[PDB]
Tab-separated table of all heavy atoms in Angstrom:
chain	number	residue	atom	x	y	z
B	449	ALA	N	52.662	6.640	56.116
B	449	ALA	CA	52.152	6.697	54.756
B	449	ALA	C	52.964	7.624	53.849
B	449	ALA	O	52.579	7.795	52.689
B	449	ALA	CB	50.687	7.135	54.774
B	450	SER	N	54.068	8.213	54.327
B	450	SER	CA	54.940	9.065	53.514
B	450	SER	C	56.158	8.323	52.974
B	450	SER	O	56.403	8.337	51.765
B	450	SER	CB	55.411	10.288	54.317
B	450	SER	OG	56.576	9.999	55.070
B	451	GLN	N	56.947	7.690	53.846
B	451	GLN	CA	58.060	6.869	53.373
B	451	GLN	C	57.563	5.759	52.449
B	451	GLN	O	58.060	5.598	51.327
B	451	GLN	CB	58.828	6.284	54.564
B	451	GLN	CG	59.945	5.292	54.208
B	451	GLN	CD	59.466	3.855	54.057
B	451	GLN	OE1	59.510	3.285	52.964
B	451	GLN	NE2	59.002	3.266	55.154
B	452	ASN	N	56.590	4.975	52.911
B	452	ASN	CA	55.911	3.975	52.093
B	452	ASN	C	54.530	4.485	51.704
B	452	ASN	O	53.853	5.139	52.502
B	452	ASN	CB	55.783	2.644	52.841
B	452	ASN	CG	55.082	1.568	52.021
B	452	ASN	OD1	53.857	1.584	51.871
B	452	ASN	ND2	55.854	0.626	51.492
B	453	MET	N	54.120	4.191	50.468
B	453	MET	CA	52.863	4.698	49.931
B	453	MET	C	52.028	3.682	49.165
B	453	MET	O	50.872	3.985	48.857
B	453	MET	CB	53.117	5.897	48.997
B	453	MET	CG	53.756	7.119	49.655
B	453	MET	SD	54.141	8.440	48.475
B	453	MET	CE	54.722	9.734	49.574
B	454	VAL	N	52.554	2.501	48.844
B	454	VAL	CA	51.886	1.634	47.879
B	454	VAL	C	51.189	0.448	48.547
B	454	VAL	O	49.957	0.350	48.515
B	454	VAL	CB	52.883	1.163	46.803
B	454	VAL	CG1	53.042	2.236	45.725
B	454	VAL	CG2	54.238	0.842	47.416
B	455	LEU	N	51.952	-0.446	49.175
B	455	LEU	CA	51.390	-1.696	49.684
B	455	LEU	C	50.600	-1.419	50.955
B	455	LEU	O	51.177	-1.176	52.021
B	455	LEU	CB	52.488	-2.723	49.953
B	455	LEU	CG	51.993	-3.971	50.702
B	455	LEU	CD1	51.170	-4.869	49.792
B	455	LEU	CD2	53.119	-4.745	51.374
B	456	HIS	N	49.279	-1.471	50.854
B	456	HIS	CA	48.425	-1.278	52.015
B	456	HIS	C	47.178	-2.130	51.831
B	456	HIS	O	46.346	-1.833	50.969
B	456	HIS	CB	48.078	0.199	52.180
B	456	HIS	CG	49.273	1.103	52.228
B	456	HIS	ND1	49.958	1.362	53.397
B	456	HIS	CD2	49.898	1.814	51.260
B	456	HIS	CE1	50.950	2.196	53.147
B	456	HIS	NE2	50.936	2.486	51.858
B	457	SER	N	47.047	-3.173	52.644
B	457	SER	CA	45.919	-4.085	52.547
B	457	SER	C	44.671	-3.434	53.132
B	457	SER	O	44.746	-2.702	54.122
B	457	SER	CB	46.243	-5.398	53.271
B	457	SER	OG	46.726	-5.171	54.582
B	458	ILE	N	43.528	-3.674	52.492
B	458	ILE	CA	42.255	-3.152	52.981
B	458	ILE	C	41.776	-4.028	54.129
B	458	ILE	O	41.652	-5.248	53.983
B	458	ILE	CB	41.207	-3.091	51.863
B	458	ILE	CG1	41.479	-1.906	50.944
B	458	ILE	CG2	39.812	-2.995	52.452
B	458	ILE	CD1	40.336	-1.575	50.014
B	459	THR	N	41.522	-3.415	55.272
B	459	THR	CA	41.060	-4.137	56.449
B	459	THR	C	39.761	-3.599	57.021
B	459	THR	O	38.935	-4.386	57.482
B	459	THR	CB	42.145	-4.118	57.539
B	459	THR	OG1	42.721	-2.805	57.623
B	459	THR	CG2	43.236	-5.140	57.249
B	460	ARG	N	39.542	-2.285	56.974
B	460	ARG	CA	38.410	-1.682	57.670
B	460	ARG	C	37.091	-2.309	57.222
B	460	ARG	O	36.807	-2.421	56.028
B	460	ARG	CB	38.398	-0.173	57.429
B	460	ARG	CG	39.561	0.575	58.075
B	460	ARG	CD	39.448	0.538	59.586
B	460	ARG	NE	40.559	1.207	60.258
B	460	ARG	CZ	40.559	2.494	60.596
B	460	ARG	NH1	39.508	3.250	60.311
B	460	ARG	NH2	41.608	3.024	61.213
B	461	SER	N	36.281	-2.720	58.199
B	461	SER	CA	35.035	-3.436	57.945
B	461	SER	C	34.116	-3.266	59.147
B	461	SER	O	34.570	-3.020	60.266
B	461	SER	CB	35.285	-4.922	57.672
B	461	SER	OG	35.965	-5.522	58.758
B	462	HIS	N	32.816	-3.443	58.907
B	462	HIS	CA	31.805	-3.053	59.887
B	462	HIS	C	31.830	-3.949	61.119
B	462	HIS	O	31.881	-3.461	62.255
B	462	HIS	CB	30.428	-3.088	59.231
B	462	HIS	CG	29.349	-2.438	60.037
B	462	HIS	ND1	28.751	-1.253	59.662
B	462	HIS	CD2	28.754	-2.810	61.195
B	462	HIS	CE1	27.837	-0.923	60.556
B	462	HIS	NE2	27.820	-1.851	61.497
B	463	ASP	N	31.754	-5.261	60.908
B	463	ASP	CA	31.714	-6.209	62.016
B	463	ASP	C	32.932	-6.071	62.926
B	463	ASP	O	32.801	-6.006	64.156
B	463	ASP	CB	31.605	-7.621	61.447
B	463	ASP	CG	32.508	-7.834	60.232
B	463	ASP	OD1	33.034	-6.840	59.691
B	463	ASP	OD2	32.692	-9.003	59.813
B	464	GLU	N	34.129	-5.998	62.340
B	464	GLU	CA	35.328	-5.865	63.160
B	464	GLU	C	35.408	-4.488	63.804
B	464	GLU	O	36.045	-4.335	64.847
B	464	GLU	CB	36.587	-6.122	62.330
B	464	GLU	CG	37.308	-4.841	61.926
B	464	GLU	CD	38.317	-5.032	60.816
B	464	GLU	OE1	39.166	-5.945	60.914
B	464	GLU	OE2	38.271	-4.242	59.851
B	465	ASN	N	34.782	-3.475	63.201
B	465	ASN	CA	34.745	-2.169	63.844
B	465	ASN	C	33.884	-2.207	65.096
B	465	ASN	O	34.237	-1.608	66.120
B	465	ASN	CB	34.236	-1.110	62.871
B	465	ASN	CG	35.309	-0.645	61.898
B	465	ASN	OD1	36.321	-0.071	62.302
B	465	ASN	ND2	35.077	-0.863	60.610
B	466	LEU	N	32.748	-2.901	65.032
B	466	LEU	CA	31.981	-3.158	66.242
B	466	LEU	C	32.826	-3.896	67.271
B	466	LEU	O	32.793	-3.582	68.468
B	466	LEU	CB	30.727	-3.956	65.897
B	466	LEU	CG	29.724	-3.265	64.982
B	466	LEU	CD1	28.396	-3.996	65.020
B	466	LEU	CD2	29.562	-1.821	65.382
B	467	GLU	N	33.572	-4.906	66.819
B	467	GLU	CA	34.434	-5.650	67.735
B	467	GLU	C	35.443	-4.726	68.413
B	467	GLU	O	35.645	-4.782	69.633
B	467	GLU	CB	35.141	-6.775	66.981
B	467	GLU	CG	35.774	-7.843	67.871
B	467	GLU	CD	35.998	-9.164	67.143
B	467	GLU	OE1	35.555	-9.299	65.982
B	467	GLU	OE2	36.605	-10.077	67.739
B	468	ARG	N	36.082	-3.857	67.630
B	468	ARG	CA	37.094	-2.958	68.174
B	468	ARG	C	36.475	-1.944	69.131
B	468	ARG	O	37.087	-1.582	70.142
B	468	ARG	CB	37.821	-2.250	67.032
B	468	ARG	CG	38.540	-3.178	66.052
B	468	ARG	CD	40.017	-2.873	65.979
B	468	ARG	NE	40.259	-1.647	65.224
B	468	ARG	CZ	40.371	-1.600	63.902
B	468	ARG	NH1	40.258	-2.712	63.188
B	468	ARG	NH2	40.594	-0.441	63.298
B	469	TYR	N	35.262	-1.468	68.824
B	469	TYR	CA	34.563	-0.576	69.747
B	469	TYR	C	34.269	-1.274	71.063
B	469	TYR	O	34.378	-0.669	72.136
B	469	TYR	CB	33.252	-0.075	69.138
B	469	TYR	CG	32.349	0.674	70.126
B	469	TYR	CD1	32.617	1.987	70.492
B	469	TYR	CD2	31.241	0.058	70.698
B	469	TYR	CE1	31.803	2.667	71.387
B	469	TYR	CE2	30.427	0.734	71.600
B	469	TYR	CZ	30.717	2.035	71.939
B	469	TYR	OH	29.919	2.711	72.828
B	470	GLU	N	33.850	-2.535	70.998
B	470	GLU	CA	33.616	-3.282	72.225
B	470	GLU	C	34.897	-3.423	73.027
B	470	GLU	O	34.885	-3.297	74.260
B	470	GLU	CB	33.019	-4.646	71.896
B	470	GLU	CG	31.511	-4.626	71.770
B	470	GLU	CD	30.842	-4.039	73.000
B	470	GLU	OE1	31.323	-4.300	74.127
B	470	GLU	OE2	29.858	-3.286	72.840
B	471	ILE	N	36.011	-3.694	72.343
B	471	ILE	CA	37.295	-3.787	73.029
B	471	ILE	C	37.627	-2.459	73.703
B	471	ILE	O	38.147	-2.428	74.827
B	471	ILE	CB	38.393	-4.227	72.039
B	471	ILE	CG1	38.575	-5.753	72.031
B	471	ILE	CG2	39.716	-3.584	72.373
B	471	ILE	CD1	37.386	-6.546	71.541
B	472	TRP	N	37.315	-1.344	73.032
B	472	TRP	CA	37.517	-0.030	73.635
B	472	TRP	C	36.689	0.114	74.898
B	472	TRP	O	37.209	0.480	75.958
B	472	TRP	CB	37.142	1.074	72.645
B	472	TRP	CG	36.827	2.425	73.281
B	472	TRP	CD1	35.663	2.789	73.892
B	472	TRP	CD2	37.676	3.581	73.326
B	472	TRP	NE1	35.743	4.085	74.334
B	472	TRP	CE2	36.967	4.593	73.995
B	472	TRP	CE3	38.967	3.851	72.873
B	472	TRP	CZ2	37.496	5.849	74.211
B	472	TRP	CZ3	39.491	5.094	73.096
B	472	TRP	CH2	38.760	6.081	73.762
B	473	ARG	N	35.391	-0.175	74.798
B	473	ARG	CA	34.485	0.049	75.918
B	473	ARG	C	34.899	-0.781	77.128
B	473	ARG	O	35.104	-0.252	78.227
B	473	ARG	CB	33.057	-0.286	75.501
B	473	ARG	CG	31.991	0.652	76.055
B	473	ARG	CD	30.608	0.127	75.727
B	473	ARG	NE	30.490	-1.269	76.128
B	473	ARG	CZ	29.399	-2.007	75.966
B	473	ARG	NH1	28.311	-1.480	75.421
B	473	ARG	NH2	29.396	-3.273	76.357
B	474	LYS	N	35.014	-2.095	76.942
B	474	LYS	CA	35.401	-2.966	78.046
B	474	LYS	C	36.818	-2.672	78.510
B	474	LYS	O	37.071	-2.544	79.712
B	474	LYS	CB	35.259	-4.425	77.625
B	474	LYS	CG	34.618	-5.311	78.664
B	474	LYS	CD	33.274	-4.741	79.051
B	474	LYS	CE	32.345	-4.611	77.850
B	474	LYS	NZ	31.227	-3.666	78.128
B	475	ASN	N	37.748	-2.559	77.571
B	475	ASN	CA	39.169	-2.488	77.859
B	475	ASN	C	39.506	-3.706	78.708
B	475	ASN	O	39.812	-3.575	79.898
B	475	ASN	CB	39.523	-1.181	78.571
B	475	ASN	CG	40.982	-1.110	78.979
B	475	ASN	OD1	41.826	-1.838	78.450
B	475	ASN	ND2	41.286	-0.242	79.940
B	476	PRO	N	39.417	-4.911	78.147
B	476	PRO	CA	39.755	-6.097	78.935
B	476	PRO	C	41.226	-6.187	79.275
B	476	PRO	O	41.580	-6.883	80.233
B	476	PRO	CB	39.311	-7.249	78.030
B	476	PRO	CG	39.493	-6.712	76.670
B	476	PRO	CD	39.122	-5.254	76.746
B	477	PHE	N	42.091	-5.496	78.536
B	477	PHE	CA	43.523	-5.508	78.787
B	477	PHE	C	43.966	-4.435	79.774
B	477	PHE	O	45.145	-4.399	80.129
B	477	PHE	CB	44.281	-5.341	77.466
B	477	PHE	CG	44.145	-6.510	76.539
B	477	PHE	CD1	43.356	-6.431	75.405
B	477	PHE	CD2	44.797	-7.697	76.808
B	477	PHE	CE1	43.235	-7.516	74.555
B	477	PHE	CE2	44.675	-8.779	75.962
B	477	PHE	CZ	43.895	-8.687	74.837
B	478	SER	N	43.055	-3.564	80.214
B	478	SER	CA	43.342	-2.559	81.241
B	478	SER	C	44.503	-1.651	80.839
B	478	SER	O	45.323	-1.257	81.667
B	478	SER	CB	43.606	-3.215	82.600
B	478	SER	OG	44.834	-3.921	82.607
B	479	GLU	N	44.570	-1.307	79.559
B	479	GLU	CA	45.667	-0.507	79.048
B	479	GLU	C	45.458	0.963	79.389
B	479	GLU	O	44.369	1.398	79.770
B	479	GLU	CB	45.784	-0.686	77.538
B	479	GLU	CG	45.528	-2.115	77.116
B	479	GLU	CD	45.590	-2.329	75.616
B	479	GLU	OE1	45.946	-1.386	74.880
B	479	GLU	OE2	45.260	-3.450	75.174
B	480	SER	N	46.521	1.739	79.244
B	480	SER	CA	46.389	3.171	79.412
B	480	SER	C	45.764	3.761	78.150
B	480	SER	O	45.450	3.054	77.190
B	480	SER	CB	47.743	3.796	79.731
B	480	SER	OG	47.647	5.208	79.818
B	481	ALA	N	45.609	5.083	78.144
B	481	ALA	CA	44.810	5.749	77.119
B	481	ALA	C	45.345	5.483	75.719
B	481	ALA	O	44.608	5.046	74.826
B	481	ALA	CB	44.766	7.251	77.393
B	482	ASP	N	46.625	5.759	75.501
B	482	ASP	CA	47.132	5.792	74.138
B	482	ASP	C	47.443	4.402	73.595
B	482	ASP	O	47.225	4.151	72.406
B	482	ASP	CB	48.356	6.703	74.079
B	482	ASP	CG	48.054	8.113	74.571
B	482	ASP	OD1	47.029	8.298	75.263
B	482	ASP	OD2	48.829	9.041	74.256
B	483	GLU	N	47.934	3.481	74.428
B	483	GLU	CA	47.970	2.086	73.994
B	483	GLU	C	46.568	1.575	73.699
B	483	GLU	O	46.392	0.689	72.857
B	483	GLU	CB	48.642	1.179	75.026
B	483	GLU	CG	50.163	1.191	75.042
B	483	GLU	CD	50.744	1.903	76.243
B	483	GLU	OE1	50.186	2.941	76.646
B	483	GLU	OE2	51.749	1.404	76.791
B	484	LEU	N	45.560	2.098	74.405
B	484	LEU	CA	44.189	1.708	74.103
B	484	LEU	C	43.761	2.242	72.744
B	484	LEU	O	43.056	1.558	71.995
B	484	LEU	CB	43.243	2.195	75.200
B	484	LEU	CG	41.782	1.759	75.064
B	484	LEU	CD1	41.674	0.275	74.756
B	484	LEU	CD2	40.975	2.103	76.299
B	485	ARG	N	44.168	3.464	72.417
B	485	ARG	CA	43.961	3.976	71.070
B	485	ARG	C	44.615	3.068	70.038
B	485	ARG	O	44.031	2.763	68.993
B	485	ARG	CB	44.527	5.387	70.972
B	485	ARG	CG	44.403	6.000	69.598
B	485	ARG	CD	43.103	6.760	69.454
B	485	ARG	NE	43.204	7.788	68.426
B	485	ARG	CZ	43.818	8.955	68.601
B	485	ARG	NH1	44.411	9.222	69.759
B	485	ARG	NH2	43.855	9.845	67.614
B	486	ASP	N	45.838	2.623	70.326
B	486	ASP	CA	46.621	1.884	69.337
B	486	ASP	C	46.067	0.480	69.111
B	486	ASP	O	45.796	0.092	67.969
B	486	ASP	CB	48.088	1.819	69.772
B	486	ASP	CG	48.930	0.889	68.895
B	486	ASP	OD1	48.924	1.051	67.658
B	486	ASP	OD2	49.613	0.001	69.455
B	487	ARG	N	45.903	-0.305	70.185
B	487	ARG	CA	45.501	-1.702	70.024
B	487	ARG	C	44.178	-1.818	69.286
B	487	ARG	O	43.945	-2.805	68.579
B	487	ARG	CB	45.389	-2.397	71.380
B	487	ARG	CG	44.999	-3.874	71.275
B	487	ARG	CD	44.543	-4.439	72.606
B	487	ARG	NE	45.665	-4.778	73.479
B	487	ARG	CZ	46.379	-5.895	73.383
B	487	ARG	NH1	46.093	-6.793	72.447
B	487	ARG	NH2	47.382	-6.113	74.221
Side-chain angles (χ1 to χ4, degrees):
Chain B
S450 86
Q451 174 273 114
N452 180 284
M453 298 176 175
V454 278
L455 171 74
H456 306 274
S457 51
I458 284 193
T459 43
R460 292 292 178 91
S461 58
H462 192 110
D463 42 348
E464 102 196 310
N465 281 297
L466 297 195
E467 195 159 354
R468 300 239 285 275
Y469 170 77
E470 273 306 322
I471 268 64
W472 159 281
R473 219 187 51 180
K474 224 56 58 199
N475 176 19
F477 292 107
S478 70
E479 321 178 6
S480 176
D482 303 18
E483 281 108 321
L484 185 47
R485 178 90 156 283
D486 172 53
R487 181 195 280 279

